[PDB]
Amino acid sequence: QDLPGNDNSTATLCLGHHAVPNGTLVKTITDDQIEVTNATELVQSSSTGKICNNPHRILDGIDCTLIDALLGDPHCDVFQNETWDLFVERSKAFSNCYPYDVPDYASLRSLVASSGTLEFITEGFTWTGVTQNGGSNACKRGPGSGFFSRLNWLTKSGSTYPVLNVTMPNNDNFDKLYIWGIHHPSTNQEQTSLYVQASGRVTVSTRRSQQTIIPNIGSRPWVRGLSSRISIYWTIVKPGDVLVINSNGNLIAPRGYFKMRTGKSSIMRSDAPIDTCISECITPNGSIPNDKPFQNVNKITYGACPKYVKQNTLKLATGMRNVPEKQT
Amino acid sequence: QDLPGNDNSTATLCLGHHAVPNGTLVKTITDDQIEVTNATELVQSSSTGKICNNPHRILDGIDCTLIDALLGDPHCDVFQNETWDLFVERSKAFSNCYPYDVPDYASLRSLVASSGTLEFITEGFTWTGVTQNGGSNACKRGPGSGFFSRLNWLTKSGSTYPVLNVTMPNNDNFDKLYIWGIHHPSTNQEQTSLYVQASGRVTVSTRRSQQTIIPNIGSRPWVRGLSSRISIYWTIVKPGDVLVINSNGNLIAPRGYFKMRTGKSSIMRSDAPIDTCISECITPNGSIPNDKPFQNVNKITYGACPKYVKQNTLKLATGMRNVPEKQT
Amino acid sequence: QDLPGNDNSTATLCLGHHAVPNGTLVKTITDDQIEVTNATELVQSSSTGKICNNPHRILDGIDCTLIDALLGDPHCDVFQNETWDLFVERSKAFSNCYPYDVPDYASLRSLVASSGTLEFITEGFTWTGVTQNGGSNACKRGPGSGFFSRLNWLTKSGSTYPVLNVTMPNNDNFDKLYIWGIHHPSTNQEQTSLYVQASGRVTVSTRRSQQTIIPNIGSRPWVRGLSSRISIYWTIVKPGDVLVINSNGNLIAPRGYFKMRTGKSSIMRSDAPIDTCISECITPNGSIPNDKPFQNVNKITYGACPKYVKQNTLKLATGMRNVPEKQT
Amino acid sequence: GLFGAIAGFIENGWEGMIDGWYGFRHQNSEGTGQAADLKSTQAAIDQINGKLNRVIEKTNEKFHQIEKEFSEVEGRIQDLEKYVEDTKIDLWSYNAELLVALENQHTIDLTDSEMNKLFEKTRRQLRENAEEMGNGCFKIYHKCDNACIESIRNGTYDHDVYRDEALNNRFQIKG
Amino acid sequence: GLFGAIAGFIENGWEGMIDGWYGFRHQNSEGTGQAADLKSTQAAIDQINGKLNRVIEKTNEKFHQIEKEFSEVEGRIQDLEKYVEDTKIDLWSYNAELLVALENQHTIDLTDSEMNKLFEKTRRQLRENAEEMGNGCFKIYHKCDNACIESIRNGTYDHDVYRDEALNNRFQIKG
Amino acid sequence: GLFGAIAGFIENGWEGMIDGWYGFRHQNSEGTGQAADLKSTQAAIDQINGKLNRVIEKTNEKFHQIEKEFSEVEGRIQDLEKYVEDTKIDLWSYNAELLVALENQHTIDLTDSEMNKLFEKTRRQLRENAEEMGNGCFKIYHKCDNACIESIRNGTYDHDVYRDEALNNRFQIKG
Numbered sequence A, B, C: 001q002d003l004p005g006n007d008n009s010t011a012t013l014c015l016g017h018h019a020v021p022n023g024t025l026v027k028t029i030t031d032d033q034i035e036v037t038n039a040t041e042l043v044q045s046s047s048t049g050k051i052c053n054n055p056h057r058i059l060d061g062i063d064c065t066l067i068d069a070l071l072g073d074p075h076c077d078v079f080q081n082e083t084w085d086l087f088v089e090r091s092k093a094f095s096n097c098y099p100y101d102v103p104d105y106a107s108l109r110s111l112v113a114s115s116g117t118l119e120f121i122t123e124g125f126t127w128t129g130v131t132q133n134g135g136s137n138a139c140k141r142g143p144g145s146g147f148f149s150r151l152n153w154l155t156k157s158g159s160t161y162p163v164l165n166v167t168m169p170n171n172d173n174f175d176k177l178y179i180w181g182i183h184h185p186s187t188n189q190e191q192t193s194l195y196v197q198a199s200g201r202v203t204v205s206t207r208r209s210q211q212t213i214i215p216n217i218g219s220r221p222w223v224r225g226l227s228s229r230i231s232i233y234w235t236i237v238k239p240g241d242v243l244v245i246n247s248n249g250n251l252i253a254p255r256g257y258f259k260m261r262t263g264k265s266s267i268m269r270s271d272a273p274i275d276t277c278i279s280e281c282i283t284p285n286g287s288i289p290n291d292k293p294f295q296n297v298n299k300i301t302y303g304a305c306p307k308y309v310k311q312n313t314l315k316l317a318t319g320m321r322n323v324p325e326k327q328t
Numbered sequence D, E, F: 001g002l003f004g005a006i007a008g009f010i011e012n013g014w015e016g017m018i019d020g021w022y023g024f025r026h027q028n029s030e031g032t033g034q035a036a037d038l039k040s041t042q043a044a045i046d047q048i049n050g051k052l053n054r055v056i057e058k059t060n061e062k063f064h065q066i067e068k069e070f071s072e073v074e075g076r077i078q079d080l081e082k083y084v085e086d087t088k089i090d091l092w093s094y095n096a097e098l099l100v101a102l103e104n105q106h107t108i109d110l111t112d113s114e115m116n117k118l119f120e121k122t123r124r125q126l127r128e129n130a131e132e133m134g135n136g137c138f139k140i141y142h143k144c145d146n147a148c149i150e151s152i153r154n155g156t157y158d159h160d161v162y163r164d165e166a167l168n169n170r171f172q173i174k175g
Ligand SMILES: *[C@@H]1O[C@H](CO)[C@@H](O[C@@H]2O[C@H](CO)[C@@H](O[C@@H]3O[C@H](CO)[C@@H](O)[C@H](O)[C@@H]3O)[C@H](O)[C@H]2NC(C)=O)[C@H](O)[C@H]1NC(C)=O
Pocket: A187, A219, A220, A221, A222, C165, C166, C167, C242, C244
């Protein structure tokens, strides 16, 4: 075959793999610090500090909480018929009208916050025999005395408060949310001055439910010059059902309904600045990128966000083990 | 050895593995479509559409909801003293007797649904000085007027409704569930016609608890010719305790107790047909086989069922990688 | 090169691994009983049966439940101003003073149990025109009649019960918890004997909230000679807010506040003996060591405990497969 | 997979092998022929079954749970009832997805291994009388008739018998 | 396991080896003996300990949680309180069961590996002077006294020293 | 890792190799050289990317959930609202921690494997003309110039060409 290759010698071939001078430590089944060539971080741990106003519809509440924007505190009149994907509620928000309390405040804030609209339709309720549009100096509207834009305070006419008995049918194909309330007077005298009967009563019902509340007379702490309170209640009336409002005094009647929708809307407490940028994931600390699978910025999130984890760093090795040849 | 081993030939032996023409794609740590020889599906995604009436005791509610079967709406009298492992409640069910509402309806439905028995024991309550067995035209029993089989409507006798004050001791070794109620009249006139006092009161108590409800007068929407309502309440009386019922008017009194048991029973809303077959896992879509570990039919289940998962298919490779030899 | 001289021979070297005569079976991905050389148990399944009184502050409730220690049942007067990391509540505990009920008992027990202190500050409430320090024979204090150490039963003075209207400002920098109540009389006569008005009323409010309760008259089961009841309520008053108590009769007034803290405290029902030893993990069955990662003693735990699991044994193989010479 | 036999040094599979998962094709003095190896075929099958059974082991049962569908809007409590179930479902879904991915990955290396183990075993048995051609075929350097092939296959091949013939044919030749 | 040494090409274990997990047994012209290998013994033990410590690392603590036992029947809220805890327990139980199964499976391949790594290492060192008998024993084709066995064991064996004697004894003979 | 090449029989890495992850250094009649192997470099990189993408695949979105911060003290219901979230967070945290540990462990054996697979592949190709020095270097027993080294590297090396020269240089010598 081949003729005399005079020189018969050898060669050496050696296989090996790279190594880097730097290297990163990662955790393993058997070790918790092993050094690899390269790694990538899976925990998003920093926010920009700003709520990007895109793609979700952020509604900055400024100094109105959603419930006051709902009831219609004068300083919140800006929010009428407004809509949101996320209503940001600020710590600075304040109330500034007739002192009220909402028995299950948390459910009403919830239910409105995810309806996502304050769209209000006025209905022609006819109150015969009482005086409409009562207002107060604790709820100044402009120069004058006023009250929640969406509620209607009825007091006696002349010398009588009759038994109100009115009805409003749901004839549309959507649910109606009616907010109403009752007035708790400070003194029996206040009770009889306004509503004549010495004990009022409100019963609001549909074919499906009923609520009767009776007022509670007594002094509470002075709030904006008043010791009385009104308490807010809510009634949802389904398509084809019917509201019947029946009262004997102390009613704070509805002026119509809010419509309820079904959507991805929610509410968030945050004092972070809104800014212009697009971010899908919102945290009360500001938006965060959602490229990593986990995050440690905040357990409160809205939108497409990484899963919150207790760890602040988790590195996925993306390279072989680093076994360098020099010293350290 | 033998001798000069001259027959110098060779052989070739080759190792290999099978391959199939078809093959199935499965997901991996490193790939999400790798083809293997064979795989098995781990997500049950289809129901038969029928609730197999075996092995659990399924009680089809037909057009009675469990709470009406409990109270004893005439059209539900079929369900007396009945028992169930699963009460199926149908969307077609309707009520057809005196308009009522149950303040914590969801807890009463729960508590009865898992007791699993409507076994009712009549007790000899003695109401002195009132008229028993009131009935109504909204609750027709046969030709006549009627009322819930298990509740007893008391009204005045002659010109008085005394203060009822009765007691019934739990002397057995099991808990007793007593269902009772209060009548909310439409008008003060109705109140005084039936119960004489212009304001009734019901207080039901044991050594351990007490509930006092006062009626609420006013008009509600017309339901089966009526604007009045009764509201249902419940009291469990433990062994050795004692019920004291005390009223001044508007009581809808109990006729005895339901006994409470502890079991695997529950309730399910489903319009699926019951059929004869044995299946351990029930879904409101019908029974499903529980041979696979996960299921994607419905998140509501009763019995030994696969764990519900969001995915509709998950294939477990049960064979090596398919590397075909052509593909025919 | 090396010059062998004379020897022509071979050697045999064999590699192998140990095996043990005993061996333990462990579960695997592919097998559920494979035998290995050694294994370690990861499920702690046994308690010592004693609650070690170290390092947490265990407060044995003896025969007082935390709510009676709070209200000040005479037999629980030992617990005044006490503190705990864990209040152990015993099944033997009993109440022995005026019959009461707490509407949301579970929340009050919760809220106090994690406050972790019964530190009580007496405030100088001035009740003008009523008789203080009412007591009863159902709450014997020593030889005499008595009442809860921390509540003050007011009844009429001479022939009147005025309208109490008092206030107490939170001027400190911590929250104040005020426990108060209302008296439900057995008969209208008892009502008028004690409180003159035929219907009392209690309204307790801050700038932020209000509660008005009206008493409920009627007979309940005889408990310690009485058919009346008092019901307990609570009001937390934040720094800078103000309590206003206003009543017309039936008030069981506060004598001051409990202070609320924030801590690792909780409550546990257990009849296990407390003993002297240090253990970090407490279970109602007694303390358990927390060296294993999981435990199957009890799902109720306080302190650094293993995660509760359904399994009673899980062995982690800590050695190679056992392939013995002989048999196993 | 980790071992580099299947879809590695063994170029591809045999759709023709219908009697087992691993096996031998051969070309010798009396012609050509194929034969499944049933021991590695059983070893691969048993592990996959063991794995399969553990995944299919006991659906646990649940009876009365919480409501998971609502018809009215209620607020706080119904919000928690929905949140508990939605987080239960996302956690069990992550679990099913990670389980089949670890499982499948392992099934692929497990069968890769069985292949390579059969290869190495055959290698060790032929001792000094064969050479690896590097595509999963051994060149046997001595005359090996069908009973000879069958002894390699059923593990009774005696290398010593053929060592002098093999070593001669393999080395000597002309270099 | 994946490598096929333990409970594979190495037929069984030595209950006699009480001084380490892996090791050597030999028969040479001077006697027979046994000796544990302590480097692979330490390698297997360290990984298993590392694994063990990570599993035993920090029981996290919880103080006031929710009630998990009830004495009255309440309905909706108590139903949710039981459902939260029951789903927490089933999720942590699935977790402990999958954890020890992956862990144990890995511990078995990890020690299988250490065995095969000791085998291959010895193989590489003996270079052209020994042959694999296929049961984890090498036939050394040259006279190897106890110090020679000891050099293989402590990794200082020089193959060159014995190459000419070995190659002769191994090949030449008569074929 | 499981295979014992990286940080095993191949004593350490080359910080000098800046053009790939695995490769060849050589010495032949024509001088000395280094060269990354790009097929095993791509094989290791693709698997690691595949792995990485699956972990980064779809953050699912959530809109209205439950409240996770409270300003008043409420008792029973708020206690449950905190317990649901705390147990959700500890479950997702255990999940992230076990995920990266299985993942990292696998990434280390996966690259260990690719190394050893390149080694074995080269070994098989050199057939009877080279010997393993046991440090990941083969001694090639015949004159092999730069094009010869290049054919081994690009997988076209024909062993037959050099077999007689190699076998002579390798065995014969003087024993
Ligand atoms: C029942 O008791 C409460 C508390 O003792 C009484 O409330 C206090 O009532 C006075 C007089 O209305 C309030 O005074 C007001 O103070 C502001 C400054 O803060 C001042 O600018 C106003 O001109 C007025 O003087 C006081 O703030 C109020 N305090 C609280 C905490 O409510 C209440 O008047 C009593 N009611 C009856 C009917 O006896």
